Amino acid sequence: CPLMVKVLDAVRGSPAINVAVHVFRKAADDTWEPFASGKTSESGELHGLTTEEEFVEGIYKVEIDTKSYWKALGISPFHEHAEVVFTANDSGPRRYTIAALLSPYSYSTTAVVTNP
Amino acid sequence: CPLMVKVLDAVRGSPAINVAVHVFRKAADDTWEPFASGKTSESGELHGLTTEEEFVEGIYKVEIDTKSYWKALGISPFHEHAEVVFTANDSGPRRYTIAALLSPYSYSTTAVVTN
Amino acid sequence: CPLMVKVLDAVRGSPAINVAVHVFRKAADDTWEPFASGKTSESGELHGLTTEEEFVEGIYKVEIDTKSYWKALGISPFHEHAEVVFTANDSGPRRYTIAALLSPYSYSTTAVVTN
Amino acid sequence: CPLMVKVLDAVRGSPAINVAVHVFRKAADDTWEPFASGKTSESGELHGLTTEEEFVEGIYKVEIDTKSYWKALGISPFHEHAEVVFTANDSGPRRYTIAALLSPYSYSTTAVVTNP
Ligand SMILES: *[B@@H-]1OC(=O)c2cc(/C=C/c3ccc4c(c3)C(=O)O[B-]4(O)O)ccc21
Ligand SMILES: *[BH-]1OC(=O)c2cc(/C=C/c3ccc4c(c3)C(=O)O[B-]4(O)O)ccc21
Numbered sequence: 117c118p119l120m121v122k123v124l125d126a127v128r129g130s131p132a133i134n135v136a137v138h139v140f141r142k143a144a145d146d147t148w149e150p151f152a153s154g155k156t157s158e159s160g161e162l163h164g165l166t167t168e169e170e171f172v173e174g175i176y177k178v179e180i181d182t183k184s185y186w187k188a189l190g191i192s193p194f195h196e197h198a199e200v201v202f203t204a205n206d207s208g209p210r211r212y213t214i215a216a217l218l219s220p221y222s223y224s225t226t227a228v229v230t231n232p
Numbered sequence: 233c234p235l236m237v238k239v240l241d242a243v244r245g246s247p248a249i250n251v252a253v254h255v256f257r258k259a260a261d262d263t264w265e266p267f268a269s270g271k272t273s274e275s276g277e278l279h280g281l282t283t284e285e286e287f288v289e290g291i292y293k294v295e296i297d298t299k300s301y302w303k304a305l306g307i308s309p310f311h312e313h314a315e316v317v318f319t320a321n322d323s324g325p326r327r328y329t330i331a332a333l334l335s336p337y338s339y340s341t342t343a344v345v346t347n
Numbered sequence: 348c349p350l351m352v353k354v355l356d357a358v359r360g361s362p363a364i365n366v367a368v369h370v371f372r373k374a375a376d377d378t379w380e381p382f383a384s385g386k387t388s389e390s391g392e393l394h395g396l397t398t399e400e401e402f403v404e405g406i407y408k409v410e411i412d413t414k415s416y417w418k419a420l421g422i423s424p425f426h427e428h429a430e431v432v433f434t435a436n437d438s439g440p441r442r443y444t445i446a447a448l449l450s451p452y453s454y455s456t457t458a459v460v461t462n
Numbered sequence: 463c464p465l466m467v468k469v470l471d472a473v474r475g476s477p478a479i480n481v482a483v484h485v486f487r488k489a490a491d492d493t494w495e496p497f498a499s500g501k502t503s504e505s506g507e508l509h510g511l512t513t514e515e516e517f518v519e520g521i522y523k524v525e526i527d528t529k530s531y532w533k534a535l536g537i538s539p540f541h542e543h544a545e546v547v548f549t550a551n552d553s554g555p556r557r558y559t560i561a562a563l564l565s566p567y568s569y570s571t572t573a574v575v576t577n578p
Contacts, residue, residue, distance in 0.1 A: 124561075127358060129425055129452030129575045175312060194343045194360055196291060199315040215470075217572055219450045221360030224340035224570060226563055227310045229475045240446075243473060245458045245540055245567030310475055331355075333457055335565045337475030340455060342448055343360045406542060425573045427521060430545040455570035458540045 118171045119152075119204075119212050121162040123180060126219045131160025134188070136181040139165060141174045148177060173205045178214050186220055193220040200225050234287040235268075235328050237278045239296060242335045243307070247276025251301045255281060258291035267292065284326075293317045294330050302336055310337040318343065349402040350383075350443050352393045354411060357450045358422070362391025366416045370396060373406035382407065399441075408432045409445050417451055425452040433458065464517045465498075465550075465558050467508040469526060472565045477506025480534070482527040485511060487520045494523060519551045524560050532566055539566040546571050 119139070123132040135156040140148040152165040178200040186193035200214050213228040235255070239248035251272045256264040268281040294316040302309035316330050329344040350370070354363035366387045371379040383396040409431040417424035431445050444459040465485070469478040481502040486494040498511040524546040532539035546560050559574040 124572060124574065126450035126453040126572055129573045131574065194318050194345070196317040196319065199317065201312040201315065202310055203312065217453060217570070219342075219357035219453075221345075222340070222342035222357035222448060222450070224338065224455065224563070226335075226338035226470060226472055227475045228470065228477065229310070229337070240457060240459060242457055242565035242568035245460045247459065247461070333455070333568060335472035335568070338472040338563060338565075340448070340570065342355060342357055344355060344362065345360045346362070425548055425575070427547040427549065430547065432542040432545065433540050434542065450572075452575070453570065453572035455568070457565075457568035460540070460567075 117163055117211065118168050118209065119165050119176075120214070121156065121165070121178060121180070122213060122215045123156050123160050123162075124215075124217045125160075126217050126222075131158065132156060132185060132216075132218055133158050133160060135160075135162075135185045137162055137165075138179045138181070140177040140179070142177075151176065168209060171205065171209075174203070175201065176204050177201045180216055182218055182223060185218070191220055195221075195223065198223045198225060200227075202227065233279055233281075234284050234326060235281050236330070237272070237281070237294060237296075238329060238331045239272050239276045240331070240333045241276075242333050247274065248272060248301060248334055249274055249276060251276075252297040253278050254295045254297075256293040256295070258293070264293055287320060289320050289322055291317065291319050296332055296334075298334055298339065301334070307336050311339065314339045314341065316341050348394055348396075349399050349441060350396050351445070352387070352396070352409060352411075353444060353446045354387050354391045355446070355448045356391075357448050362389065363387060363416060363449055364389055364391060366391075367412040368393050369410045369412075371408040371410070373408070379408055402435060404435050404437055406432065406434050411447055411449075413449055413454065416449070422451050426454065429454045429456065431456050463509055463557065464514050464555065465511050465522075466560070467502065467511070467524060467526070468559060468561045469502050469506050469508075470561075470563045471506075472563050472568075477504065478502060478531060478562075478564055479504050479506060481506075481508075481531045483508055483511075484525045484527070486523040486525070488523075497522065514555060517551065517555075520549070521547065522550050523547045526562055528564055528569060531564070537566055541567075541569065544569045544571060546573075548573065 125132040138153045139151040141151040143149045180198040241248045254269040255267045257267040296314040325347040332341045356363045369384040370382045372382040411429040440462040447456045471478040484499045485497040487497040489495045526544040
């Protein structure tokens with residue numbers, strides 16, 4: 117699993133379940149091409165987005181759909197989504213975990229990058 | 233000052249100085265149109281971005297060029313930049329502070345919306 | 348103002364108002380001695396805690412009574428309070444801002460140390 | 463595992479390894495009695511601190527020794543440690559994960575509380 121996303125809810129003190137995530141990759145013409153998508157599980161985790169073969173060098177954008185999450189819970193949040201934009205695999209293949217902690221008016225994101 | 237941006241450095245415990253910040257307004261065809269920009273001050277703040285007349289309801293994106301900031305300090309960072317995307321709403325209070333706390337592999341952002 | 352405290356609310360996107368804050372100084376026998384206290388203002392800030400003469404080098408603890416803040420809003424929180432423990436050092440810059448961002452099950456804190 | 467601690471390093475983008483953690487429990491006389499301690503693994507995780515039988519109702523303090531961590535890496539950080547103080551198990555037994563994200567002048571902590 118070269119790319120995984122984990123999301124927590126800071127209001128409930130729980131995983132953030134059923135959060136939609138869309139991944140994009142910058143194309144040769146500088147536009148954002150759709151790359152993969154999914155939604156977090158009961159554990160707040162999203163596995164299986166991509167494969168080592170498919171996850172080549174590039175600039176990637178991980179869009180976490182925080183507004184749809186909070187709205188689905190009847191809350192009116194500030195942000196449209198959380199965007200995480202990074203260059204991947206430019207010193208060879210790595211494994212990336214993108215973690216996010218959500219509140220209605222705030223979010224934090226961190227990356228864990230390991231060499232397999 | 234309907235819109236202010238404040239950036240802090242979690243490695244040095246200081247304002248993040250001379251960081252470029254670009255604000256964009258989502259257009260009817262979903263593209264991002266330049267709206268305002270500047271560089272944070274010695275206190276990590278960027279004032280004077282817009283006026284109440286110009287800052288109408290809509291979706292806005294604040295892009296903070298974190299990568300150049302870290303490179304200038306000799307540190308290799310993870311993100312290309314930090315992005316804060318939000319809807320301005322006339323119902324709610326009238327002044328928006330977008331704050332961001334920067335680390336090489338992480339950032340946090342919060343909105344302080346007051347009258 | 349050698350020491351300032353600023354508290355923000357991540358659920359409502361606002362200053363955290365009327366929050367009690369207690370500062371303690373570690374004594375030679377390792378107990379925590381009351382040093383200064385107050386309540387955050389309408390802007391979430393507490394100024395005037397100490398003076399440069401009194402704020403000598405040493406270990407200090409800032410306790411933010413987050414539990415009462417959330418209960419007053421009708422929200423059940425996790426922490427008894429937030430604690431920020433640090434050494435004041437004359438070498439480094441002279442003004443300390445302790446900032447804290449509050450959620451029911453989480454908090455973040457950073458130090459902004461300037462001259 | 464009723465109590466687990468996970469620590470990440472926001473400068474390196476990695477687990478925070480070999481972080482000492484001391485847990486205390488408030489006694490009947492209002493003092494902090496030592497309850498359990500350990501250090502994080504190569505994965506940044508600390509398991510096996512306590513048992514369901516031992517982890518009774520009480521007010522607990524989890525002290526994460528961030529200064530010793532940063533100093534062991536030759537860095538001069540701001541905080542002495544990160545303290546996480548909470549009432550546990552007062553509506554029956556729960557499982558607690560205490561997570562922390564560290565920088566030299568900043569830290570964030572969140573709790574994940576589940577009912578087994
Ligand atoms: B994310 O995790 C954080 O700890 C954090 C902190 C902040 C912003 C704190 C802040 C806001 C406004 C002001 C200060 C600090 C300050 O020192 O002076 B101020 O201009 O009044 C944002 C996001 C995250
Ligand atoms: B920003 O401010 C935060 O407090 C924060 C917290 C996190 C969470 C990271 C995390 C917690 C638990 C677990 C992982 C990651 C993980 O990879 O596995 B796990 O043990 O289930 C992210 C960002 C921010």
